Design a protein around this ligand. Structure first.
Ligand SMILES: N=C(N)c1cc(-c2ccccc2)c(CNC(=O)c2cccc3c2OCC3)s1
Ligand SMILES: N=C(N)c1cc(-c2ccccc2)c(CNC(=O)c2cccc3c2OCC3)s1
Ligand SMILES: N=C(N)c1cc(-c2ccccc2)c(CNC(=O)c2cccc3c2OCC3)s1
Ligand SMILES: N=C(N)c1cc(-c2ccccc2)c(CNC(=O)c2cccc3c2OCC3)s1
Ligand SMILES: N=C(N)c1cc(-c2ccccc2)c(CNC(=O)c2cccc3c2OCC3)s1
Ligand SMILES: N=C(N)c1cc(-c2ccccc2)c(CNC(=O)c2cccc3c2OCC3)s1
Ligand SMILES: [Cl-]
Ligand SMILES: [Cl-]
Lengths: 227, 6, 227, 6
């Protein structure tokens, strides 16, 4: 690893600087290096890892969608070739993230908050692979299984307003609607998540209340689009 | 398009 | 060159796709490959080259400014090291662009519109080097000389509302204000450019009129900040 | 900060 010679603390510090500088590819490289030191990640460090790769793959997904739309309309080799280039790079980033989760973040996650976070990430990165897949069936099943295991743990171990639990349910609902062709499942999950969070807000501080309601707004926004 | 976690 | 095996037309087509996908590093690589085919660039192709590298170096400049500000406030080695990493990458991109201009875009530019465009680019990329330099004196002189040669040609060969002439004068005025510590020169150049363009608008079509007035707005905006 | 060509 190109980051093998840098101290763990220095990698984390530089990931935070890269975030402020909007240098997300650098941020992801620093956080991959930190993960590869073999120690568990704190909550803050898990958030840095997630932000970095979400931004990298987000740009790739946005580009792929533009190119796939151009390719569909035109139906020379250039559009297909360039779409394939972007697709391959996106798949490579997803495979890198999934590799970090499998070697060895998930197995070493020795409490529910960490394990849920990583299983949610696993679902997310299989979902991104599914967006470009044609197998697609196997990828969809891997995403669903990761998300469902995360949901089972989150329902036993976290309150309904916990932001990781909320974000997991949100993203699993998106999986159902956009990937699995299961819009009824998406709507049911978003609705139950929203209602159970609503009924738990009374337990929260002003700060946690703002945290939770921000994510609940996204559940509401999807339900408005889907119904 | 559906909105995922931000 | 990694693009040596791709057809020139395919490189141009892919640069246009990369622009639509907001993949500016890819766009710059495709356009560098096109330049290295050794044929002159059309107006459209010069614009693609400029857009690509402007966006790449723009992100690097924005990151460098964030990091340099953090470094100044803190005055471990991490902030300096990461600022230096970004600085080195920015300098490398500028050196690449200047290398394309010197081998051999400028010498092969066989008319005034092309030569002015490339000399303006030369001034711009030396200006970006000057922003991070400490020599700085030599770089500042190279930028000024490129800009001044472009100005001399543009004043003889282009009307005052030509958008390349306007953009050149705008960027040279920024050079004077921000780099050369010559705010009076900046103000004088912006004012004379604005007034001479104003007096030439009557010669333009509705479309050219919108082109020219858009750039004139930036001259106005700077004069408002500078006076 | 001064504005350059867009
Ligand atoms: N550097 C970063 N990007 C983060 C560092 C930490 C952190 C965690 C623990 C201790 C210290 C820092 C983060 C915790 N996540 C959030 O706050 C968050 C995430 C998603 C959306 C919103 C959020 O807040 C308002 C809206 S994000
Ligand atoms: N148990 C909890 N409810 C939390 C404990 C900590 C924590 C803080 C400091 C140190 C260790 C843990 C939290 C920090 N916030 C997040 O991670 C977060 C993640 C995703 C989205 C949002 C988030 O907040 C705003 C919205 S949330
Ligand atoms: N398929 C379903 N499960 C629904 C059918 C109807 C419906 C509509 C018209 C007439 C009859 C039924 C629903 C009404 N929306 C909600 O309850 C709801 C709850 C929380 C948040 C939001 C909501 O909407 C947008 C944002 S949800
Ligand atoms: N793909 C691209 N980015 C371009 C292709 C061509 C082109 C040139 C000749 C023939 C065909 C295309 C361009 C010409 N520049 C502009 O129009 C332009 C530049 C800066 C600012 C503004 C502009 O317009 C309104 C505001 S930009
Ligand atoms: N002589 C002229 N006034 C032009 C001739 C051509 C041209 C068109 C087709 C083919 C060949 C040349 C032009 C295309 N516009 C540009 O390049 C341009 C560049 C920078 C900024 C702006 C621009 O336009 C809007 C604002 S401008
Ligand atoms: N140093 C200078 N050359 C100036 C001194 C004063 C001045 C101000 C107050 C009192 C006396 C003089 C100037 C007045 N601004 C202009 O003419 C002008 C012309 C075109 C466009 C813009 C302009 O302003 C903002 C945008 S310019
Ligand atoms: Cl390609
Ligand atoms: Cl570094």
């Amino acid at each position: 690893g190109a980051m093998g010679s840098m101290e763990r603390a220095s990698l984390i510090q530089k990931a935070k600087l890269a975030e402020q500088a909007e240098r997300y590819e650098d941020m992801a490289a620093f956080m991959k290096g930190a993960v590869e030191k073999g120690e568990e990640l704190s909550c803050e460090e898990r958030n840095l890892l997630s932000v970095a790769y979400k931004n990298v793959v987000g740009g790739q997904r946005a580009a792929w969608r533009v190119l796939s739309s151009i390719e569909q309309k035109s139906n020379g080799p250039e559009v297909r070739e360039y779409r394939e280039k972007v697709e391959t790079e996106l798949q490579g980033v997803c495979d890198t993230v999934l590799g970090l989760l499998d070697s060895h973040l998930i197995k070493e996650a020795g409490d529910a908050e960490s394990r849920v976070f990583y299983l949610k990430m696993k679902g997310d990165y299989y979902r991104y692979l599914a967006e470009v897949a044609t197998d697609k069936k196997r990828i969809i099943d891997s995403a669903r299984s990761a998300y469902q295991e995360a949901m089972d743990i989150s329902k036993k171990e976290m309150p309904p307003t916990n932001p990781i639990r909320l974000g997991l349910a949100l993203n699993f609902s998106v999986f159902h609607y956009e990937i699995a062709n299961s819009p009824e499942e998406a709507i049911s999950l978003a609705k139950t998540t929203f209602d159970e969070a609503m009924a738990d807000l009374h337990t929260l501080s002003e700060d946690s209340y703002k945290d939770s309601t921000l994510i609940m707004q996204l559940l509401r926004d999807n339900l408005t689009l889907w119904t | 398009r559906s909105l995922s976690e931000r």
